[PDB]
Amino acid sequence: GSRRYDSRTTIFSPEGRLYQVEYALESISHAGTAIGIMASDGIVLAAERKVTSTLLEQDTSTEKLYKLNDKIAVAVAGLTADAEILINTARIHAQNYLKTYNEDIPVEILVRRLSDIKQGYTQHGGLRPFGVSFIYAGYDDRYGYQLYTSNPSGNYTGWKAISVGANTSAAQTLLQMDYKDDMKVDDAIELALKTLSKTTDSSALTYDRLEFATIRKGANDGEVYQKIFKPQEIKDILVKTGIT
Amino acid sequence: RCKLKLLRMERIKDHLLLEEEFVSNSEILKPFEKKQEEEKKQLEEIRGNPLSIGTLEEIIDDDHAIVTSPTMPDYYVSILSFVDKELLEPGCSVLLHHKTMSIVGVLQDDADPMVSVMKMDKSPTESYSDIGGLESQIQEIKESVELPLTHPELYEEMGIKPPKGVILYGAPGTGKTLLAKAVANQTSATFLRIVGSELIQKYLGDGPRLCRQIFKVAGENAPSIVFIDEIDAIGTKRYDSNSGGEREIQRTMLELLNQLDGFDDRGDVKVIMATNKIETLDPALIRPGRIDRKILFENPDLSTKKKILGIHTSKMNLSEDVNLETLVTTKDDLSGADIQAMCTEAGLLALRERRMQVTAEDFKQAKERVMKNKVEENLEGLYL
Amino acid sequence: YDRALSIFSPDGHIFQVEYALEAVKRGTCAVGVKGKNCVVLGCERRSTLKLQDTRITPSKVSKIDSHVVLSFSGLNADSRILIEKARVEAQSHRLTLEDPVTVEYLTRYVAGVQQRYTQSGGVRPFGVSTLIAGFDPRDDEPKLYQTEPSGIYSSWSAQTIGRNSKTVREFLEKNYDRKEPPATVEECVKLTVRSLLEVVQTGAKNIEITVVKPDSDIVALSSEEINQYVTQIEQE
Amino acid sequence: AAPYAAKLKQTENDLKDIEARIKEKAGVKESDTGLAPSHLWDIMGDRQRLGEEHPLQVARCTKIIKGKYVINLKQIAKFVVGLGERVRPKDIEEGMRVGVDRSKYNIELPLPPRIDPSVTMMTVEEKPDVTYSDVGGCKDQIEKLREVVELPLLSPERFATLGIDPPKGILLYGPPGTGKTLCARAVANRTDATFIRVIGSELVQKYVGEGARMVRELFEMARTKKACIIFFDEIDAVGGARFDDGAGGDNEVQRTMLELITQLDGFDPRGNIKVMFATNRPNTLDPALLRPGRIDRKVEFSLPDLEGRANIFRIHSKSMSVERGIRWELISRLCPNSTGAELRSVCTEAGMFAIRARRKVATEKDFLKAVDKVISGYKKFSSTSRYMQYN
Amino acid sequence: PGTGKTMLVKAVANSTKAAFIRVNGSEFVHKYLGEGPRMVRDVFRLARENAPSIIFIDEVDSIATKRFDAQT
Amino acid sequence: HHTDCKFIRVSGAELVQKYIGEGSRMVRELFVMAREHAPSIIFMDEIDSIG
Amino acid sequence: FLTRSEYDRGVSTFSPEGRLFQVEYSLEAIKLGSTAIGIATKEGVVLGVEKRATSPLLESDSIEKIVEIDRHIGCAMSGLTADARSMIEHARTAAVTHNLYYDEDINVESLTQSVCDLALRFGEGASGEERLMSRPFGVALLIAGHDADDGYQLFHAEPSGTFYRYNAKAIGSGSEGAQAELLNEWHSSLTLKEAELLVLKILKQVMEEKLDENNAQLSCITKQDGFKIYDNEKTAELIKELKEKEAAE
Ligand SMILES: Nc1ncnc2c1ncn2[C@@H]1O[C@H](COP(=O)(O)OP(=O)(O)OP(=O)(O)O)[C@@H](O)[C@H]1O
Ligand SMILES: Nc1ncnc2c1ncn2[C@@H]1O[C@H](COP(=O)(O)OP(=O)(O)OP(=O)(O)O)[C@@H](O)[C@H]1O
Ligand SMILES: Nc1ncnc2c1ncn2[C@@H]1O[C@H](COP(=O)(O)OP(=O)(O)OP(=O)(O)O)[C@@H](O)[C@H]1O
Ligand SMILES: [Mg+2]
Ligand SMILES: [Mg+2]
């Protein structure tokens, strides 16, 4: 019948644990490096694409960066297919909050809601988890700039600087050594590009393999300018830092 | 250091023993005495020229026997019978006469290469208190292993049977391995050591014969201590499944019950078992009276590690820089094999330098390599 | 899906509850001690990792009502579910019965909550254990309860859960007195800090303390405060 | 370093060298047995030697031809032989071994049959004096045994007066630690019949059909033996139930399982072979090695009662020095329903606490500690509920 | 073996027209003591004498086996 | 070659043996031959896919 | 552990025994329970439980196993108490329902039997009613009560779905050592205080700690006073008067 074939993937191990979560985390270290560095003036999200071909179009590609709302964007690392669902659910929650309070969502609320959604899959239903990790860059007036990371378990932690995906530990040591408590967005851009230059699996780090976006307090009096850069602007700031 | 004089003194006792021994053999071993000459003469008169190794299948009590030679033909042999009619038994190697085959004599002993694995030539250069620390759960292994060999007198005041058996269990690296090898240096009785992955074989039928053997040899020498290291290895190791499998494992366990206690009434075989899969064993194995006091080991506590770490750094070069107390702070209920791998890897840092000083920096650095092992087969970071 | 994630074991147990208990043993350690007029929950936070934002990240002690705190050990992800259910029940009580909850009733509710995911099909238990503490309203008796993923609830004079709770428990037998709590709040706090320094070790930045006084006063002491308390204990 | 190390290096290596040299020069010795109560043997030892009278090529009868014989030697080589003048013709039987002249093959002295068994002479066992009173209690289950096995050896008169067929077989089963084998060592003391002890896992060999030889021959050797008992120990492996696998390796084992059936019933009865099977488990056994006519009465061996533990513990503490005024009743109550093998170990662990306090005696205090010690480990362990259902 | 492995051997043997030796493992096989090893040594000796040569052993399945007992 | 050891390649084979024929009764004897002919380098190659 | 079983893949599956295996398992989880002794006389029913401390830090006068169903029915739980948590709620509801429908006291037997109906709902979805359990309960009750039609009753409720009326019954780990004594010491001429001290007697012998009012608790059901839980002071008095009559032998 059907109990015959049931695998029971939401039970504990003798460890008290969940293999499926571990396996999802394992598969995300097969996915690209995504980095978030928080400056005192903004947040830099820098993601390295997984695929690159001189036949690939990378000009409509936003495979890793997504706007959840025009204050909060994410860097995505893991299974893209699962991530897409969560992205549109997230947007729907954002608009719901905006709907019923007529005031923009804090970063807190959204990160947690998504964490709960992930938690539901591991808790019951016999389903496999959604194998995604998110770095959230957001601005709210209550805590200002906020940087968050959440994992397939449905747990979140705030950070000052963080890396997810491939070579988590390496990039983390780098960021330790090269972090300042307050930085500029330019200093932050420089540090981000450098860290991806020392962790990239191809000898060279190129604009056509970089996705790069910021949220900046350039815009004044409590406005933030999101920017999803063009690869041709990424090119120029890649020559600024002297990588190319 | 400063032991030069005593080593010269020992050496000096050795010079004198080598000397007098040698001269005694040489020419004043005088075989001009008739109780030497006449005994060998008429002993060689019936004794061969070719001595025709045979194998004694069984004896008959009419001064005869049937031998089967490895060359082929059997023979119904006589026996000269100055060799003590009843001193030879099935499995003996006998000397047959190059003419009419008579049992000229009997070889006392013969051995296998499969019992070479069992038996040992070693004399450990570690004695106890290189197991310094965990020094009250080691009174359960030197009051039921060491002591009744040393004093049966104490167990005579109380009378009744003396202790028999232990099972050691706990976390890996908490000293189980060295505990067994440390009581064997004290007791100085036949120490057999057999791995449990050789008790598991890819051939059946010879499994049971191996297991039956260990204790038959062990009883044969009057004192023996049999270390079965890793009886956790009998359910997790297995080759093919058509000559291994359930069947192989079940039989060997069955054999061990008869051997360990059973009905053999064999010699003294004090048993030591190391294991951390104690629930893959029978209830007639972990039955009392084959385990008498069983020892549980858990990870040391903070002040116990101080005992462990000072044992390990006495062999090393030291400075005033070195501080043991803060290496202890970082670790939290870990094994003493982890502590022991920090001190081994600390000199690997000194090897890397090619600088023979060991410093607080070398111990702290290898501490980080040791903690890298624990939590980087982990990929949570913080408990999800 | 209605298939069991809970199979009865011939041992007299259910495997998953055992596995849950193990999960709760791997979790960070919490201590609870109640004075005569206060409750003190001390918790270990792993701030060993660097460049961690701690301002925006919730402490491991969650206020569930204006006078009822919950601390936890075990699966961090899972706990948030219990926390939402409990806040909800807290409001329900006021709605239909009027007068904030009592510690016991809320404790009982949480007990049933974790119990239900055992007995139901399609669900596995939670591997989370909670310390619920607080005051009843119109009252000034500190009430300290412990719930465990077995779905069994307990009152305690003092209790500890999490990693290496046994060491601190032995300490508590010997430094806390069933007859007499330390009467001043500060002394209670410092008793628990002295307890925490057994296992937590490695500076005074991993220690977090929340203190609750009746009349709905929940306050969490920042790191500076703790630094002073710890150093006093250190000198003595 | 220190100003001795440069020469400690050399002095120490000299120790290692000289021990090897002393041993090497001293030489060794390996005995080639003799006897001191013998110093002359060759006055007529040479008649056994040198002037042959003769040692003999051992053979085997393959064909009696009625009025010569065909033997095939062990050198495989077939010859035709007859009768000397120390032979009797009535004394040649099929499959019997004989001695023939190493030169001109002729039978001189016939010899016992069957040289293929040689590992059944090491399962013949003298009776250990574990004594017949050694067994616990005066309970009644061992008195059933004394009706089946023991008494018809002493007195087949009363069974001749009854005229019944005397029961021969019996099953020993029940939990371990009850002294399953300990009452069979007692009964080995009393009956003074041959005890031939078998291990079920000792019946399995590398190649299949090799253990078929073993079992068959073991039985017939016991038929020749008169007033014997075969104690089937631990035959849970070979002895188990029969079933099919279609690709298994259990089949090759089940061959010798069958070999056990075909000898018990036979085509001839067991002539004074009393048969014991000792099984840990009734949960799996053959239904034709557990048929009730060849295992006749089967006795369940039980856990001691609240009286039975008091009896066992009195056998055990009467053997120990304790200082008088104690209760053997009290200790049984404190224990749950349990084994006496625990009771054998309450004394000995209480004695290790006796030496710890450095008593020559044992008192009530140390008994209490011991009772706690064993119970707590029992809970930590299997078979506090294991019986693998059935009754 | 239905693939024509040997067919190919015959084909180019007929083409090159060099010396060829037809042996098999049932032509090396033991029948009395010390027979088998001797058979091995001979065939190479002949090959070298009239070198160059091809030595063909049709099957070595029996002769070689990944596993062995070697307890008998 | 530089350590001056006997390079003993082990590969899971038993054709090398014709006198014991299994490695569960040749671990000690393997070690012991390298002791006779010391020093040695015992290249136990465990591929960890065999079978 | 891993006792040989052919079936643990179903929760309603046979079993060459001819009975359910899971039910069997359930009855082996009452042997770890803390001992509950219950003496039924014709003058009241006495329920004694060992509260079971595990730490001196544990407050054991705020935990108890005596659980009131209603004024005229009391109940003691032994085994796994997280399951009893649910069952006792259900029973309280049932009693209140009866008094709503009939303005009448519920029979002790009818109540016991209702909770047995509750016990047997384990399954994946079978007979006419929906299974909302998946594994059977592992907790047994001693339901004591008094009704005006059969007097005092003491019932043993099983996780099987079966109920036996007892005149005295002990459950828990020390249940066999207690029941041996029940068979001998009980009779129908007891009085309330004699039965009370009898409970403390047999509770002594299954005591794994020590007898005092801090790990031991009494409760009664009497006709004209209802269900009353004895406070700790009174319990202490009785324990000391046991010690008086223990030193009179
Ligand atoms: N409690 C201790 N006191 C002194 N030395 C110790 C202690 N524990 C470990 N050591 C040191 O650590 C060593 C490594 O231990 P060993 O390899 O014998 O550990 P183990 O517990 O037997 O490992 P495994 O878990 O693999 O069976 C020992 O050889 C010993 O010198
Ligand atoms: N009935 C008894 N009376 C006295 N001593 C007993 C009794 N039963 C067991 N013993 C003691 O326990 C020891 C060991 O028990 P024994 O080895 O006979 O168990 P077993 O019944 O053969 O179990 P198994 O064969 O399954 O391992 C005996 O040597 C004896 O000292
Ligand atoms: N390519 C082909 N052209 C024609 N005939 C072929 C071809 N391949 C194979 N055959 C035929 O198939 C048969 C088998 O080929 P072959 O004689 O080469 O033996 P084989 O494959 O090595 O078998 P084995 O080694 O088991 O004896 C022969 O009759 C051969 O002529
Ligand atoms: Mg080891
Ligand atoms: Mg036995």
Ligand SMILES: [Mg+2]
């Ligand atoms: Mg071919």
